[PDB]
Design an enzyme around this catalytic site. Structure first.
Site, short mmCIF file in Angstrom:
data_model
loop_
_atom_site.label_atom_id
_atom_site.label_comp_id
_atom_site.label_asym_id
_atom_site.label_seq_id
_atom_site.Cartn_x
_atom_site.Cartn_y
_atom_site.Cartn_z
N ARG A 95 -30.69 -11.14 -80.10
CA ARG A 95 -31.10 -12.53 -80.03
C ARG A 95 -30.42 -13.31 -78.91
O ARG A 95 -29.28 -13.05 -78.55
CB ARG A 95 -30.85 -13.21 -81.37
N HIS A 114 -22.99 -10.13 -77.38
CA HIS A 114 -23.15 -9.50 -78.68
C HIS A 114 -22.21 -8.31 -78.58
O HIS A 114 -21.84 -7.91 -77.48
CB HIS A 114 -24.58 -8.99 -78.89
N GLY A 115 -21.81 -7.75 -79.72
CA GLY A 115 -20.92 -6.61 -79.70
C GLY A 115 -21.18 -5.61 -80.81
O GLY A 115 -22.07 -5.80 -81.64
N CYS A 130 -20.20 -11.35 -80.86
CA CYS A 130 -20.93 -11.57 -82.11
C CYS A 130 -21.50 -10.27 -82.68
O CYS A 130 -22.24 -9.55 -82.00
CB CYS A 130 -22.04 -12.60 -81.88
#
Ligand SMILES: [Zn+2]
Lengths: 238, 91
Positions: free
Chosen positions: A39, A98-99, A148
């Site tokens: 996203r 993101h992670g 995130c």
């Protein structure tokens, strides 16, 4: 006083007297390819602006590079490591993206490039070694990641060294319902810095952050810092 | 998965400290996931594989384990994330 002789003690605290203090690279990944399924990280732009403003006031030459693929993040980090830090006292890398998990005994974690391709925190950290970047040898190398979701041997010598990684996967927003309000963890970090950087070292600042994250929930509370600094780090405040 | 499955059990680990002449308690070391390598006061964790040497008198194996190998899963399993972070946030 007790706090004055600790800040100056060249044996206990890194000396951050140069102006500028060092480089600060901020990788800000907001838009990801549709195919990855990741996203759009709205609110990241405000997180970035908060950190950009934060480190600027801490005397770092801040450069923001947005929407980098995994490979370009590596290139951007190799680039930063390839520069001459001879006249600088510290280096800062901030990654917002993101992670995902990536096991490692010292620097676990990974972050995604806008392509959804992972880049482990270990690779990111080791880009700045004493062979590829002797220029930053003995100088603090800070890593702040919002992703995130005795002595060691082999040869006895303290390694990693002068590396500090704050890895956060706390997904909360300043305004829990608005994904555009900004990251709760980033805000908490900025807030703590604004009020205590002038008198407290990095460890104490992040302890306050951990303390805050703690009364917010906690299963995550994974800012899990990986502290391999050899001295206390007091930033050079405005 | 541990790097050394054969040392996953405390009993197997304490065994390797047969003739341990160092001040650092061998029982603590084994509890902390370490096992002696046979040379000097060198030990390695059965899970993460991290090795430690040159131990000091009153040095705690768990603290040293968390200080140097914060990513060890055995460490996390036994002490929890709060413990690791706190070790790193209070040097
Ligand atoms: Zn271990």
């Amino acid at each position: 006083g007790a706090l004055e002789s600790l800040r100056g003690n060249a044996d206990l605290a890194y000396i951050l007297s140069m102006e500028p203090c060092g480089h600060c690279l901020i990788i800000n990944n907001v838009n990801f390819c549709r195919e990855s399924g990741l996203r759009t990280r709205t609110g990241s732009n405000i997180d970035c602006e908060k950190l950009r403003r934060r480190f600027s006031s801490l005397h770092f030459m801040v450069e923001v590079k947005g929407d980098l693929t995994a490979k370009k993040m590596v290139l951007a980090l190799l680039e930063l490591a390839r520069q001459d830090h001879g006249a600088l006292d510290c280096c800062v890398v901030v990654i917002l993206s993101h992670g995902c998990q990536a096991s490692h005994l010292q620097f676990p974690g990974a972050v995604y490039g806008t392509d959804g391709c992972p880049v482990s925190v270990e690779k990111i950290v080791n880009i700045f070694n004493g062979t590829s970047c002797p220029s930053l040898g003995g100088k603090p190398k800070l890593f702040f990641i919002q992703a995130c979701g005795a002595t060691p041997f082999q040869s006895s010598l303290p390694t990693p060294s002068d590396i500090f990684v704050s890895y956060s996967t706390f997904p909360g927003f300043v305004s829990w319902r608005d994904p555009k309000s900004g990251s709760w963890y980033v805000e908490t970090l900025d807030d703590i810095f604004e009020q205590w950087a002038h008198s407290e070292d990095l460890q104490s600042l992040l302890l306050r952050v951990a303390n805050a994250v703690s009364v917010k929930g906690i299963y995550k509370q994974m800012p899990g810092c990986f502290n391999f600094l050899r001295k206390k780090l007091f930033f050079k405040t405005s | 998965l541990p790097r050394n499955p054969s040392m996953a059990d405390y009993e197997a680990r304490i065994f390797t400290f047969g003739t341990w002449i160092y001040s650092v308690n061998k029982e603590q070391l084994a509890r902390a996931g370490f096992y002696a390598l046979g040379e000097g006061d060198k030990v390695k964790c059965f899970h993460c594989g991290g090795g430690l040497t040159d131990w000091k008198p009153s040095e705690d194996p768990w603290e040293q384990h968390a200080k140097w190998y914060p990513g060890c899963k055995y460490l996390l399993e036994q002490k929890g994330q709060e413990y690791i972070n706190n070790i790193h946030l209070t040097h």
